[PDB]
PDB file of C-alpha atoms and ligand atoms in Angstrom:
ATOM      1  CA  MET A 187      23.938   1.874 112.231  1.00 31.13           C
ATOM      2  CA  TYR A 188      25.826   0.523 109.189  1.00 30.38           C
ATOM      3  CA  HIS A 189      28.297  -2.277 109.115  1.00 30.80           C
ATOM      4  CA  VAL A 190      30.729  -3.517 106.499  1.00 27.62           C
ATOM      5  CA  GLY A 191      28.969  -6.258 104.512  1.00 29.85           C
ATOM      6  CA  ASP A 192      25.663  -4.645 104.727  1.00 24.33           C
ATOM      7  CA  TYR A 193      23.845  -3.779 101.611  1.00 22.17           C
ATOM      8  CA  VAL A 194      22.350  -0.204 101.251  1.00 20.99           C
ATOM      9  CA  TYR A 195      20.054   1.436  98.774  1.00 16.96           C
ATOM     10  CA  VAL A 196      21.814   4.731  97.833  1.00 18.49           C
ATOM     11  CA  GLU A 197      19.853   7.799  96.422  1.00 17.93           C
ATOM     12  CA  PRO A 198      20.630   8.104  92.899  1.00 18.52           C
ATOM     13  CA  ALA A 199      22.017  11.713  91.661  1.00 18.57           C
ATOM     14  CA  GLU A 200      18.815  12.020  89.579  1.00 17.86           C
ATOM     15  CA  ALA A 201      15.948  12.084  92.130  1.00 14.38           C
ATOM     16  CA  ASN A 202      13.454   9.367  91.593  1.00 14.31           C
ATOM     17  CA  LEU A 203      15.469   7.018  89.542  1.00 15.29           C
ATOM     18  CA  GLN A 204      15.879   3.663  91.083  1.00 13.91           C
ATOM     19  CA  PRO A 205      18.091   3.769  94.209  1.00 17.70           C
ATOM     20  CA  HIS A 206      21.618   2.085  93.732  1.00 22.16           C
ATOM     21  CA  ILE A 207      22.252  -1.152  95.531  1.00 24.63           C
ATOM     22  CA  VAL A 208      25.575  -1.056  97.434  1.00 25.35           C
ATOM     23  CA  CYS A 209      27.605  -3.450  99.430  1.00 25.55           C
ATOM     24  CA  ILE A 210      29.424  -1.520 102.134  1.00 25.06           C
ATOM     25  CA  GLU A 211      33.241  -2.518 101.989  1.00 24.33           C
ATOM     26  CA  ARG A 212      34.396   0.063 104.132  1.00 26.00           C
ATOM     27  CA  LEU A 213      33.294   3.132 106.437  1.00 29.27           C
ATOM     28  CA  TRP A 214      35.038   6.289 107.657  1.00 27.89           C
ATOM     29  CA  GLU A 215      34.587   9.730 108.743  1.00 29.82           C
ATOM     30  CA  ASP A 216      36.445  12.875 107.369  1.00 28.91           C
ATOM     31  CA  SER A 217      37.618  15.590 109.538  1.00 29.47           C
ATOM     32  CA  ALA A 218      34.558  17.344 109.054  1.00 29.54           C
ATOM     33  CA  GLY A 219      32.673  14.561 110.895  1.00 29.12           C
ATOM     34  CA  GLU A 220      30.905  13.364 107.603  1.00 29.12           C
ATOM     35  CA  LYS A 221      30.519   9.921 107.565  1.00 26.71           C
ATOM     36  CA  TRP A 222      31.346   8.068 104.142  1.00 26.83           C
ATOM     37  CA  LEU A 223      31.138   4.584 102.903  1.00 27.67           C
ATOM     38  CA  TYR A 224      33.038   2.979  99.932  1.00 30.13           C
ATOM     39  CA  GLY A 225      31.715  -0.034  98.377  1.00 29.29           C
ATOM     40  CA  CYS A 226      30.625  -2.131  95.240  1.00 30.87           C
ATOM     41  CA  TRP A 227      27.814  -1.193  93.089  1.00 32.33           C
ATOM     42  CA  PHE A 228      25.298  -3.825  92.247  1.00 31.99           C
ATOM     43  CA  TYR A 229      23.668  -3.320  88.770  1.00 29.04           C
ATOM     44  CA  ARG A 230      19.877  -3.665  88.108  1.00 28.67           C
ATOM     45  CA  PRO A 231      19.021  -5.621  84.572  1.00 26.79           C
ATOM     46  CA  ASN A 232      18.462  -2.082  82.987  1.00 28.83           C
ATOM     47  CA  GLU A 233      21.627  -0.567  84.177  1.00 29.68           C
ATOM     48  CA  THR A 234      23.275  -3.059  81.885  1.00 24.41           C
ATOM     49  CA  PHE A 235      23.965  -3.450  78.158  1.00 24.40           C
ATOM     50  CA  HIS A 236      22.881  -7.268  77.339  1.00 27.49           C
ATOM     51  CA  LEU A 237      21.625  -9.365  74.484  1.00 30.29           C
ATOM     52  CA  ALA A 238      17.955  -8.398  73.834  1.00 29.80           C
ATOM     53  CA  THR A 239      17.371 -12.221  74.359  1.00 30.59           C
ATOM     54  CA  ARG A 240      18.974 -12.457  77.918  1.00 32.32           C
ATOM     55  CA  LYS A 241      16.531 -13.525  80.233  1.00 33.28           C
ATOM     56  CA  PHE A 242      16.756 -12.466  84.211  1.00 34.02           C
ATOM     57  CA  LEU A 243      15.644 -13.812  87.302  1.00 28.92           C
ATOM     58  CA  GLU A 244      13.056 -11.651  88.983  1.00 30.23           C
ATOM     59  CA  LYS A 245      15.221  -9.824  91.376  1.00 29.85           C
ATOM     60  CA  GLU A 246      18.581 -10.460  89.634  1.00 31.19           C
ATOM     61  CA  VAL A 247      21.387  -7.915  90.178  1.00 32.28           C
ATOM     62  CA  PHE A 248      25.106  -8.042  88.632  1.00 27.01           C
ATOM     63  CA  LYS A 249      28.281  -7.339  90.776  1.00 32.21           C
ATOM     64  CA  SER A 250      29.736  -4.713  89.006  1.00 30.98           C
ATOM     65  CA  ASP A 251      33.421  -3.313  88.632  1.00 30.37           C
ATOM     66  CA  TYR A 252      32.237   0.170  89.736  1.00 30.20           C
ATOM     67  CA  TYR A 253      33.128   1.145  93.122  1.00 31.29           C
ATOM     68  CA  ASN A 254      32.685   4.564  94.839  1.00 34.24           C
ATOM     69  CA  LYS A 255      32.348   6.397  97.814  1.00 33.48           C
ATOM     70  CA  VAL A 256      29.149   8.293  99.132  1.00 36.16           C
ATOM     71  CA  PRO A 257      28.165   9.667 102.410  1.00 37.95           C
ATOM     72  CA  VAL A 258      26.091   7.639 104.481  1.00 40.15           C
ATOM     73  CA  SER A 259      23.489  10.410 104.630  1.00 36.73           C
ATOM     74  CA  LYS A 260      22.556   9.182 101.058  1.00 31.01           C
ATOM     75  CA  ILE A 261      21.280   5.738 102.282  1.00 34.37           C
ATOM     76  CA  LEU A 262      17.773   5.160 102.015  1.00 32.81           C
ATOM     77  CA  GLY A 263      17.544   1.879 103.956  1.00 32.95           C
ATOM     78  CA  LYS A 264      18.994  -1.698 103.851  1.00 32.26           C
ATOM     79  CA  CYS A 265      18.590  -4.685 101.499  1.00 30.90           C
ATOM     80  CA  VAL A 266      20.337  -8.016 100.850  1.00 28.42           C
ATOM     81  CA  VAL A 267      21.890  -9.689  97.985  1.00 29.77           C
ATOM     82  CA  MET A 268      21.997 -13.332  98.069  1.00 30.94           C
ATOM     83  CA  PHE A 269      24.701 -15.624  95.840  1.00 35.96           C
ATOM     84  CA  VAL A 270      22.376 -17.554  93.542  1.00 41.94           C
ATOM     85  CA  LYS A 271      23.522 -20.852  95.298  1.00 42.51           C
ATOM     86  CA  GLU A 272      21.792 -19.788  98.485  1.00 41.37           C
ATOM     87  CA  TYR A 273      19.142 -17.708  97.085  1.00 42.74           C
ATOM     88  CA  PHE A 274      16.513 -20.525  96.354  1.00 38.98           C
ATOM     89  CA  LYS A 275      17.003 -22.553  99.601  1.00 37.10           C
ATOM     90  CA  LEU A 276      17.666 -19.618 102.290  1.00 38.60           C
ATOM     91  CA  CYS A 277      16.196 -16.314 103.007  1.00 38.52           C
ATOM     92  CA  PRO A 278      17.200 -13.461 105.299  1.00 39.01           C
ATOM     93  CA  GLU A 279      15.497 -12.779 108.539  1.00 37.04           C
ATOM     94  CA  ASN A 280      13.711  -9.235 109.016  1.00 39.10           C
ATOM     95  CA  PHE A 281      13.804  -8.447 105.198  1.00 37.06           C
ATOM     96  CA  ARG A 282      10.816  -8.011 102.923  1.00 36.63           C
ATOM     97  CA  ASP A 283      11.056 -10.228  99.618  1.00 38.78           C
ATOM     98  CA  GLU A 284      11.270  -6.952  97.895  1.00 38.93           C
ATOM     99  CA  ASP A 285      14.425  -5.817  99.361  1.00 42.77           C
ATOM    100  CA  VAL A 286      16.226  -9.281  98.750  1.00 41.21           C
ATOM    101  CA  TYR A 287      18.015  -9.778  95.365  1.00 44.23           C
ATOM    102  CA  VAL A 288      19.669 -12.703  93.833  1.00 45.16           C
ATOM    103  CA  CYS A 289      23.140 -12.589  92.200  1.00 44.64           C
ATOM    104  CA  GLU A 290      24.712 -15.024  89.689  1.00 45.29           C
ATOM    105  CA  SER A 291      26.944 -12.960  87.546  1.00 46.12           C
ATOM    106  CA  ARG A 292      29.360 -10.266  87.477  1.00 50.51           C
ATOM    107  CA  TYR A 293      28.866  -7.650  84.938  1.00 51.61           C
ATOM    108  CA  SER A 294      31.786  -5.056  83.831  1.00 52.76           C
ATOM    109  CA  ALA A 295      30.713  -1.519  83.083  1.00 51.68           C
ATOM    110  CA  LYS A 296      34.132  -1.090  81.426  1.00 52.35           C
ATOM    111  CA  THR A 297      33.646  -3.783  78.678  1.00 52.11           C
ATOM    112  CA  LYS A 298      29.907  -4.347  78.770  1.00 54.85           C
ATOM    113  CA  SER A 299      30.586  -8.056  79.647  1.00 54.64           C
ATOM    114  CA  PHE A 300      28.806 -10.719  81.842  1.00 56.26           C
ATOM    115  CA  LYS A 301      30.833 -13.728  83.752  1.00 54.92           C
ATOM    116  CA  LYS A 302      29.259 -16.017  85.867  1.00 56.37           C
ATOM    117  CA  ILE A 303      30.590 -16.150  89.565  1.00 53.21           C
ATOM    118  CA  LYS A 304      32.170 -19.220  90.829  1.00 55.18           C
ATOM    119  CA  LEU A 305      33.276 -17.972  94.284  1.00 59.35           C
ATOM    120  CA  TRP A 306      31.172 -15.598  96.460  1.00 57.19           C
ATOM    121  CA  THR A 307      33.614 -13.240  98.308  1.00 57.97           C
ATOM    122  CA  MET A 308      31.592 -10.477  99.881  1.00 59.38           C
ATOM    123  CA  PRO A 309      32.259  -9.446 103.313  1.00 58.91           C
ATOM    124  CA  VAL A 310      30.221 -11.224 105.912  1.00 61.28           C
ATOM    125  CA  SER A 311      27.611  -9.103 107.551  1.00 59.23           C
ATOM    126  CA  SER A 312      25.403 -10.143 110.642  1.00 60.87           C
ATOM    127  CA  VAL A 313      22.189 -10.792 108.284  1.00 61.96           C
ATOM    128  CA  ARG A 314      20.986 -14.333 109.568  1.00 59.08           C
ATOM    129  CA  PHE A 315      19.776 -16.826 106.813  1.00 60.17           C
ATOM    130  CA  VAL A 316      17.431 -19.372 107.544  1.00 59.47           C
ATOM    131  CA  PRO A 317      15.932 -22.215 105.144  1.00 59.31           C
ATOM    132  CA  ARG A 318      12.850 -21.080 103.159  1.00 58.70           C
ATOM    133  CA  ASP A 319       9.785 -22.780 104.452  1.00 60.94           C
ATOM    134  CA  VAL A 320       8.510 -22.298 100.689  1.00 59.78           C
ATOM    135  CA  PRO A 321      11.173 -22.776  98.218  1.00 59.47           C
ATOM    136  CA  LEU A 322      11.210 -20.003  95.437  1.00 57.65           C
ATOM    137  CA  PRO A 323      10.410 -20.899  91.714  1.00 53.04           C
ATOM    138  CA  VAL A 324      13.254 -20.301  89.417  1.00 51.64           C
ATOM    139  CA  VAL A 325      11.759 -17.858  87.007  1.00 53.70           C
ATOM    140  CA  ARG A 326      13.511 -16.165  84.018  1.00 53.02           C
ATOM    141  CA  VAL A 327      11.964 -13.284  81.741  1.00 51.70           C
ATOM    142  CA  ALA A 328      13.647 -11.260  79.095  1.00 52.01           C
ATOM    143  CA  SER A 329      13.129  -7.286  78.789  1.00 51.14           C
ATOM    144  CA  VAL A 330      10.070  -5.918  76.798  1.00 47.43           C
ATOM    145  CA  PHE A 331      11.235  -3.518  73.716  1.00 46.45           C
ATOM    146  CA  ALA A 332       8.433  -1.484  72.526  1.00 48.34           C
TER     147      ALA A 332
HETATM  148 CL1   CL B 172      23.852 -10.700  77.375  1.00 45.00          CL
END
């Protein structure tokens, strides 16, 4: 069911936290027959430390430097992360908009720093992208602090 280049929701370690968004970079099984994936975590805005004034696109995520392995049994479903240069003009067939995210920047969880992406270099999956019949508004909003 899963292929390299797919993005998946992975069960968090604490139940009921938001699932992690992971791009599958490798798949294998161990001698026990347990199936595993390895990939890059994409962080939601509240998983990063950022200037309180920073504005986020709705559905923004950040390509992180955190990579890990998890059993394929921890997958909750598929999703898609699109590079910002394509997200506004194209959308992925067979995905609900709630499961389509946009990525403009990397975030390092080592240094708590952001950097704009110049070249998108993720593995190519079988997702099929078509031009949007309805362009998405560019809409950026900051976090709310009590
Ligand atoms: Cl920031």
